[PDB]
Amino acid sequence: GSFVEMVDNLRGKSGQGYYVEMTVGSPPQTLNILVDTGSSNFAVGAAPHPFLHRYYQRQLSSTYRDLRKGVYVPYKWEGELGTDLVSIPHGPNVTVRANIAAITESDKFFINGSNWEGILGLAYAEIARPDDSLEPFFDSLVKQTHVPNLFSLQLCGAGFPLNQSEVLASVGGSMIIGGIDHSLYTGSLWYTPIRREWYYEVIIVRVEINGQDLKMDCKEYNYDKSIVDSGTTNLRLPKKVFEAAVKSIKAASSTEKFPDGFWLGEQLVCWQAGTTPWNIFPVISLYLMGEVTNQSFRITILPQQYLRPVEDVATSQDDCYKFAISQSSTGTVMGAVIMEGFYVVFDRARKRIGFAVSACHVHDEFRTAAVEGPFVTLDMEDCGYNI
Ligand SMILES: CC(C)C[C@@]1(C)NC(=N)N(Cc2ccc(CNC(=O)Nc3ccc(C#N)cc3)cc2)C1=O
Numbered sequence: 451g452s453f454v455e456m457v458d459n460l461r462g463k464s465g466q467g468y469y470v471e472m473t474v475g476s477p478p479q480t481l482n483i484l485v486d487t488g489s490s491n492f493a494v495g496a497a498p499h500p501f502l503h504r505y506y507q508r509q510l511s512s513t514y515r516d517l518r519k520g521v522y523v524p525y526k527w528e529g530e531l532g533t534d535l536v537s538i539p540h541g542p543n544v545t546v547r548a549n550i551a552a553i554t555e556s557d558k559f560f561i562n563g564s565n566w567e568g569i570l571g572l573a574y575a576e577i578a579r580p581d582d583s584l585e586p587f588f589d590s591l592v593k594q595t596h597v598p599n600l601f602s603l604q605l606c607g608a609g610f611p612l613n614q615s616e617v618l619a620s621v622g623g624s625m626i627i628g629g630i631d632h633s634l635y636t637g638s639l640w641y642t643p644i645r646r647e648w649y650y651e652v653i654i655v656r657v658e659i660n661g662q663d664l665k666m667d668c669k670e671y672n673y674d675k676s677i678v679d680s681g682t683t684n685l686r687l688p689k690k691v692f693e694a695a696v697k698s699i700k701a702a703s704s705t706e707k708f709p710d711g712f713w714l715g716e717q718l719v720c721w722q723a724g725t726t727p728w729n730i731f732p733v734i735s736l737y738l739m740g741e742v743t744n745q746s747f748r749i750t751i752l753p754q755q756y757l758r759p760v761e762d763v764a765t766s767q768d769d770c771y772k773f774a775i776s777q778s779s780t781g782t783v784m785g786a787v788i789m790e791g792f793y794v795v796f797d798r799a800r801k802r803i804g805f806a807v808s809a810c811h812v813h814d815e816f817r818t819a820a821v822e823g824p825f826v827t828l829d830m831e832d833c834g835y836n837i
Pocket of ligand 1: 525
């Protein structure tokens with residue numbers, strides 16, 4: 451591990467998000483900021499809100515610059531554009547002038563108890579609001595400093611519920627800015643092409659549930675796109691792929707009957723402490739296009755990743771979980787529960803995303819997450835969706 455100053459700089463969890471400490475303004479104002487690879491705006495609460503115990507006060511920053519332009523982001527939050535000096539305490543020792551959207555109005559944006567006050571959009575300018583002329587934070591970082599155009603994320607799910615006091619004292623992972631820290635993963639890193647620079651878009655070419663091919667036209671897996679998004683909790687799958695996957699997951703776990711509410715990801719299921727039947731649930735393998743023609747690799751997740759720990763509505767001693775796979779109408783989304791199994795490298799300089807087994811993924815004595823390759827795969831370019 452060559453980036454010790456950034457290791458363990460994250461806190462949070464899949465459901466409420468993973469955040470990193472940042473400072474904005476002069477003198478520096480400390481804020482917790484959601485790490486989001488699925489958006490491209492650096493935006494912070496800048497006005498009183500029931501869920502914020504602190505917010506960006508522009509009038510107290512001598513380096514604040516008003517852009518005299520509003521921004522509307524409906525998913526929704528509204529803000530005022532400006533720039534100011536930004537730093538990451540547990541990151542590269544550099545200060546950069548970046549665009550900041552001061553959130554003045556928000557609806558269902560801030561999460562009660564998440565402990566974060568802003569969002570750091572790490573994706574490309576093509577999806578930045580109001581438009582692509584608003585330079586994303588990481589772009590500014592790279593243009594103004596010597597920091598390598600690359601970042602890596604190790605999101606660490608605890609494998610069990612973290613109460614309000616525990617999630618504040620618990621290390622939730624690492625965001626390494628400008629490099630790859632080898633202590634964060636085991637085995638080898640496998641790279642899949644970033645198909646286009648807007649979201650971190652990738653191409654899935656094969657899906658297996660316990661080794662069984664889901665056998666769908668691979669274009670279905672990427673309809674209308676597949677992205678890596680730390681701002682989403684679940685593994686989200688296109689409607690038809692979701693239906694086929696759930697059918698297969700139910701078949702594999704048929705020794706136990708689960709209510710429809712469970713499969714809809716709306717209700718928790720509980721087992722007596724320590725007795726969760728991990729082995730009746732199948733592993734899920736996603737094959738990704740490789741860097742070499744006709745070559746792919748696979749990332750395999752365990753039910754310890756797709757079953758999200760939730761505290762029993764009775765706070766009992768039972769181990770309870772919600773099914774963290776849901777349907778999407780916007781393509782495949784590899785959210786935080788999937789990222790928790792892997793050390794993910796966003797190699798912007800080489801337009802590639804790397805995957806390796808996470809040194810902090812949750813597992814059991816019989817199965818482990820995996821990243822394996824290579825596999826002969828033909829016509830992978832046809833798995834990509836075109837409008
Ligand atoms: C691919 C992308 C364009 C879609 C998506 C989901 N991925 C993102 N990273 N963001 C950005 C994002 C990140 C984090 C938040 C945090 N607040 C929320 O979640 N509130 C919320 C609450 C309940 C529901 C529901 N029912 C929906 C949203 C909001 C937006 C998105 O909007």
